[PDB]
Amino acid sequence: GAMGSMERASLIQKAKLAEQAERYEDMAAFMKGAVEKGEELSCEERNLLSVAYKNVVGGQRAAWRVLSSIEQKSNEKGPEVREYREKVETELQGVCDTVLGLLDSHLIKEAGDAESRVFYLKMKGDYYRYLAEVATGDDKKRIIDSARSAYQEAMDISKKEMPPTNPIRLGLALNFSVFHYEIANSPEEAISLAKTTFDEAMADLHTLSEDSYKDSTLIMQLLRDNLTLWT
Amino acid sequence: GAMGSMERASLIQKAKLAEQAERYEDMAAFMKGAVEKGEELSCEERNLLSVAYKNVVGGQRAAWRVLSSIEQKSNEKGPEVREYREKVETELQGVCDTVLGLLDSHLIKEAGDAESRVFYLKMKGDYYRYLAEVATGDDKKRIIDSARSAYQEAMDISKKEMPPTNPIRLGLALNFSVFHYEIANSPEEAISLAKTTFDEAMADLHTLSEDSYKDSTLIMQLLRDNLTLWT
Amino acid sequence: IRSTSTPNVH
Amino acid sequence: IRSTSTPNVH
Ligand SMILES: *CC(=O)N1CC[C@@]2(CCN(S(=O)(=O)c3ccc(Br)c(F)c3)C2)C1
Ligand SMILES: *CC(=O)N1CC[C@@]2(CCN(S(=O)(=O)c3ccc(Br)c(F)c3)C2)C1
Ligand SMILES: [Cl-]
Ligand SMILES: [Cl-]
Ligand SMILES: [Mg+2]
Ligand SMILES: [Mg+2]
Ligand SMILES: [Mg+2]
Ligand SMILES: [Mg+2]
Ligand SMILES: [Mg+2]
Ligand SMILES: [Mg+2]
Ligand SMILES: [Mg+2]
């Protein structure tokens, strides 16, 4: 592809520049190029990949929600709202497919540390979840199952291999709880997971790490905020 | 082009949806499609065109400035910063060329009301000005002359045909003054134009229009703010 | 109000 | 600080 001729180190460098310039589509392209070199990503590099694609898909989800709301309200009319919602939807699905493709073809492996394996399986769950937000019919049930299965595998590893305050473990649990509440229509499972996650993190607060405690405490608060919203 | 099969009214409708969804590249593409139908744009439609392209080029300018600043600071080093700055620059120039192409091929005419003629010539000045921000050498002198000539023609029409509080007249004068200060390195001309514009608007304040006085008074304040900055 | 998920924070 | 130009509002 388009990044084939560029050195890995140069792609990482340009991803960082694109982040500074708030050029997230470019950032995502650079990081895809870096992934396709076929070497593992470090923690910091996984962050770049994550930030880039989350920004791109986040803009699409926000746009999709606006248009879907106009559409639903207009179904209480020409084809234009539906057409444009479908256009944005198609682009969103394409970005999710790209991410899921990278995860499957390059990033998800049996080897590597717990952090990397959990992070990538969390990411697989997230991008299936984003597909599930716009899916209908047959496709939707399948997508939801794929999301659940990725999250559950990530959860199994995180509980065995990571401290209960680890930010990836916490972020995974937060996102899985959101899946349960918003996607799978299982509020009780959502509440239970979020409560267990928060309580176990507090009980072993001493496991906070010097280099990530700010991220941990932020996710702990987001768990508490959802618990307040859901009860 | 890609919007050739879509009805004009549908393109306008979708531009409005894209604006609501903050999808400004889409908005610009829809409005380009509408322009290419070859009918005049109304005031409201000119607004959609303006908002869309200004958002797109605004993001590119902001990104270019970040990268240019990193570049200048790194020249106190591999090629990556320069390369990526050039990439963003090339895209920005592409957008300006698109806009200038639309203005020349479709929108700038001898006929039509004063508002439309002034608006399009102002827009021509602005997009040459954006080209001038990133230009060098012979290309730059040509670009600056083109910007000045567009603005001056717009000014001549506005002073003959529009009240001194008209928001297009004021916005043109504001932007031409910025050209003088930031591009043409003529602070005295900038100050003089901004002062004259503000004072003449105040002197004939009674010409404010019921449907645009909020825009007028906003530009008057921006003239004052620049005058405070420049003195 | 949608549930909050993991933010895109560096 | 850069001079302010016409904003992208209406
Ligand atoms: C070390 C490693 O692999 N990391 C750290 C950063 C990141 C990229 C995104 N996450 S996350 O989704 O698990 C997460 C995001 C935000 C926050 Br505040 C958080 F605690 C976790 C892990 C890859
Ligand atoms: C009637 C007409 O042709 N209009 C009204 C809106 C607009 C689109 C952009 N301008 S402008 O650049 O002259 C301008 C922008 C903002 C403000 Br607050 C302003 F007063 C003027 C005119 C086209
Ligand atoms: Cl469409
Ligand atoms: Cl580049
Ligand atoms: Mg390489
Ligand atoms: Mg669809
Ligand atoms: Mg204990
Ligand atoms: Mg046609
Ligand atoms: Mg040195
Ligand atoms: Mg150049
Ligand atoms: Mg001089």
Q: Is A174 at the interface with chain C, CB within 8 A? A: yes
Tokens of A57: 């898909």
Breaks (C-N over 2.5 A) in chain B follow: 76
Nearest of A104, A124, A120 to residue A43 by alpha carbon = A120
The answer to whether the Cα torsion of B24, B30, B33, B37 is positive or negative is negative
Domain ranges across chain A: 8-230
Overall CATH class of domain B8-230? mainly alpha
Backbone angles phi, psi at B88, to 5 degrees: -65, -40
* Beta carbon of A218 within 6 Å of any ligand 1 atom: yes
Select from A30, D8, A132 the least CA-distant residue to B50.
D8
Q: Atom of ligand 2 at shortest distance to CA of B47?
A: 8
- Backbone angles phi and psi of A185, in degrees to 5: 50, 55
Q: Which residues of chain C are at the A interface, by a Cβ-Cβ cutoff of 8 Å? A: 1-10
Method of structure determination: X-ray
Nearest residue of A to residue B13, measured between CA atoms: A80
Q: What are A164's two structure tokens?
A: 């209960």
Kindly state the tokens that stand for B61.
């300018």
Q: How many CB pairs under 8 A join B and D?
A: 38
Q: Say if residues B180 and B144 touch (Cβ distance below 8 Å).
A: no
- Rounded distance, CA A42 to CA B29, Å? 39
Is residue B171 a contact partner of residue B162, using CB atoms and an 8 Å limit? no
Cβ atoms A168, A209 nearer than 8 A: no
Q: Quick one: resolution in A?
A: 1.9
3-state secondary structure of A2: coil
- Per-residue HEC secondary structure of chain B comes to CCCCCCCHHHHHHHHHHHHHCCCHHHHHHHHHHHHCCCCCCCHHHHHHHHHHHHHHHHHHHHHHHHHHHHHHHCCCCCCHHHHHHHHHHHHHHHHHHHHHHHHHHHHCCCCCCHHHHHHHHHHHHHHHHHHHHHCCHHHHHHHHHHHHHHHHHHHHHHHHHCCCCCHHHHHHHHHHHHHHHHHCCCHHHHHHHHHHHHHHHHHCHHHCCCCCHHHHHHHHHHHHHHHHHHC
Question: Among partner residues C2, C3, C9, which is closest to A218 by beta-carbon distance?
Answer: C9
Which of A99, A117, A168 should be mutated for ligand 1, with most atoms under 8 A from CB?
A: A168
Min Cα–Cα distance to chain A from B1, Å: 17
Contact A186, A228 (CB under 8 A): no
Q: What angle do CA B184, B24, B64 make, to 5 degrees?
A: 40
- DSSP run (H or E) holding A151: helix A137-161
Q: Which helix (H) or strand (E) holds A19?
A: helix A8-20
B125 lines ligand 2 (CB under 6 A): no
What would the two tokens of residue A215 be?
A: 């991220």
Tokens describing residue A140: 């939707």
Please, what's the b/e burial string for B152-169 (b: 16 or more CB within 10 A of its CB; e: otherwise)? ebbbebbeeebbbbbbbb
- Tokens linked to A69: 């709301």
If DSSP codes are grouped into helix, strand and coil, which group holds residue A50? helix
